[PDB]
């Protein structure tokens, strides 16, 4: 089986990761574009980037709160090689199709171990962050987030979702549970890959989960952009219709969550998969 | 697969053998305390395993950036609030395993008995037995997603109950030992509080400590926080468990060497100094 090509993406000295973002974070008025509702947004608890290397985790560290976690929604296996964040990238990210968070754990403890301290590690570098030509690292430690987080004193949850897409309905009846689970001084740090579709999705439920009955759908979507996500709304102007027509299935979820949103404020007293039973 | 077992009810608060650096030793008349130097500094507590509310209550008291570290190799993780595990003879679960394959063996006997009636989980005697609960359907969860819950960090190291740690846990954790932040405190817990987090309470003692702070007085210090006694062995009745406690103390003088030669983990690491 194709394990994916062994790909960069963040350098070791690279250091706040690109769109990160708090719930605290500015949303300014121009002449031609107002300012979506901001009710409810500053007392959500809640961060996202795209992926971090050591010494950006460090970093941000120093600005996180107390009993922070970081929730790391990459089903693609990745971790770190010294300061480097690398990851094994399929065609369109897809990697480890279908498979949940202890399947994802375990294959890529199995394929970071095998570039543990051996030298001429070749890395692949995308045109857009440094490339196209490859990085050749090592002999340098390799470790996953899991472990890294764990060695700033940060709390660590993974939940596999697929880049580009939704996350599936057994992921988000997962995260519902563990949002309530969370005590009330419990803060949340999302990231995926580039910090854009995934990371979005999930500050925007639990924006939902705290907000949906008082605050319209639209200006939910639109704050989580204005923040410094991605906008989930946005389409091409017809160049991408797949990827449009892909955004699509995500948008249609991410009502059909508002909605649910609405029916079991903070995700009570129905969890996601009973309310789609009913 | 192992057994079934009960390790702390849900209804259990504090767990036993919970004792932190701070804890009081104090003198008795026929027991000295032994060096108190550099004990209270090291950010560090442990514990025998505790249920989810023993663990957001001891979240109460746990500095900032806190870690759970578990030792445990055993399959294990909570059944509701109760803590379970799968226990295998003499608790010998997933023999020389490490801890990302624990995981996920771990995870699918986790799920196995998520939100399941009818689950009988065995009670030794010392843990309220011998009849054993019925319990389900109750939500299973791993201890890594317990800890992610209260904004904990969680350090999975696997190793056998009863005995030392692998050379490469070791290596493990004196790498981890070192990429800590000075404010990173650590609990270290096992099943019973005793010999496994004993002993890594002592290894992140003498990282610290060994050059200045004799070895048997480290030994007792951790016996006397709260700890196991590492030195000690049966009158001749368990033969087989005092070998373990030897070749346990062996390791531990060896460990105190290295730390002695590469104080905190430096320059040299436990395998490295190991091959010279």
Redesign the interface.
């Known amino acids: 089986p194709d394990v994916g090509v062994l790909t960069l993406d963040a350098p070791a000295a690279s250091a706040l990761p690109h769109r990160f973002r708090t719930c605290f974070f500015p949303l300014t008025a121009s002449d031609g574009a107002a300012v979506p509702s901001r009710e409810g947004l500053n007392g959500l608890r809640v961060s996202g980037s795209s992926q971090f290397s050591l010494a950006g985790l ?1 970093l941000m ?1 120093e600005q996180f709160p ?4 970081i929730v790391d929604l990459r089903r693609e296996s990745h971790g770190f090689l010294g300061g480097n964040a690398v990851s094994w990238r399929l065609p369109d990210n897809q990697g480890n199709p279908g498979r949940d968070a ?2 994802v ?2 294959a890529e ?2 394929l970071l ?1 095998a570039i543990d301290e051996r030298p001429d590690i070749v890395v692949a570098r995308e045109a857009r962050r440094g490339g196209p030509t490859p990085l050749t690292l090592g002999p340098l ?1 390799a470790v996953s987030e ?2 890294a ?9 993974r939940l596999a979702v697929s880049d580009h897409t939704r996350p599936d309905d057994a992921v988000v009846e997962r995260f519902v ?2 949002s309530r ?3 009330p ?3 949340l740090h999302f990231h995926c890959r580039g910090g854009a579709g995934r990371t979005t999705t999930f500050m925007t439920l639990v924006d939902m989960l705290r907000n949906a009955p008082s605050v319209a759908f639209e200006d939910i979507i639109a704050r989580q952009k204005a923040l410094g996500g991605s906008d989930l709304a946005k389409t091409s102007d017809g160049s991408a219709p797949g990827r449009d027509a892909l955004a699509r299935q995500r948008l249609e979820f991410l009502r059909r969550f508002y909605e649910y949103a609405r029916a079991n404020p903070g995700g009570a007293p129905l969890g996601w998969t009973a309310w789609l039973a009913g």
């Open positions: 460090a560290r107390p009993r922070a976690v202890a399947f754990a375990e403890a199995a171990a430690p899991a472990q987080a764990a060695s700033l004193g940060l709390g660590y949850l549970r563990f689970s969370l005590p001084d419990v803060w």
